[PDB]
């Protein structure tokens, strides 16, 4: 009868393969609604 969650218990002296690699996952999504996340030039005359 096991408790699911187990702790990383990070330490600063471990390897580069056991050290906290923060992660961010960006998903871009497209519905039948007005898209608004549009993410981005000089003037001359005569």
């Amino acid at each position: 009868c096991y408790f699911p969650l187990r702790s990383y218990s990070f330490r600063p002296t471990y390897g580069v393969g056991h050290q906290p690699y923060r992660v961010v996952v960006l998903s871009f999504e497209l519905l039948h609604a007005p898209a608004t996340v549009c993410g981005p030039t000089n003037l001359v005359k005569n």
């Epitope: 096991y2 187990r6 471990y14 390897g15 393969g17 056991h18």
Partner: antibody, heavy 117, light 110 residues
């Protein structure tokens, strides 16, 4: 009492096919991470295959592709489909429960396997 | 190429502490957890030490396990006759994505 008992071991010709089986009591094979490990006479336990709760399988390098691990729907028993044998598959296969990926808590008694004519 | 290396044999007389060293590349034993198994003759491996130091389910005491850098050490105060078996060290090599075991020591009591 907890126990895992395995059958299906005997003489077989090179290139044959077997269905070894792991029967689980007191425990439920469709949940605990189950493992097939081997040891040729005079040799060292070598990881053959691990079955995850969610159905995912992992196999070693030497034992890739030819083999297959499977988890019964209702019989509370797991099976190894050994196919395309060679000389280096002479073994005493064991099935063992492994908390996560950390340590192998329970080991079955042992089922000889021989590849010769 | 990662497969932990273990001395072919270790021997001591009763009353003398026995030390076994399992060494491997820091790909698997420097980033994951060692565990130590005992195989009595003609039987099946019995878990002995898990999670780098612990001793499960009331194993006979004086059995100790430690981890130093890229190595692991098992220790038995004295060399009792009943402890004669093969000893293996296992870690989950993520590079190979596979359990990797040591060579195995033939502990003989002098």
């Amino acid at each position: 009492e907890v126990q895992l008992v395995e059958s299906g071991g005997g003489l077989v010709q090179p290139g044959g096919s077997l269905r070894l089986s792991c029967e689980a009591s007191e425990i439920i094979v469709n949940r605990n991470y189950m493992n097939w490990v081997r040891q040729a006479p005079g040799k060292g336990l070598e990881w053959v295959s691990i079955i995850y709760p969610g159905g995912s399988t992992f196999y070693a390098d030497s034992v890739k592709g030819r083999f297959t691990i499977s988890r019964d729907n209702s019989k509370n028993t797991m099976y190894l489909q050994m196919n395309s044998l060679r000389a280096e598959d002479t073994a005493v296969y064991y099935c063992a429960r492994s908390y996560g990926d950390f340590y192998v808590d329970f080991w079955g008694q042992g089922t000889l396997v021989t590849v010769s004519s | 190429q990662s497969v932990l290396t273990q001395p072919p044999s270790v021997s001591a007389a009763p009353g003398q502490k026995v030390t076994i060293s399992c060494s491997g590349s820091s790909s698997n034993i420097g980033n994951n957890y060692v565990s130590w198994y005992q195989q009595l003759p003609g039987t099946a491996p019995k878990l002995l030490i898990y999670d780098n130091n612990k001793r499960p389910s009331g194993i006979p005491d004086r059995f100790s396990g430690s981890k130093s850098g890229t190595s692991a050490t098992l220790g038995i105060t004295g060399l009792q006759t009943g402890d004669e078996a093969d000893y293996y060290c296992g870690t989950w090599d993520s590079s190979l994505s596979a359990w990797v075991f040591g060579g195995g020591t033939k502990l003989t009591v002098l």
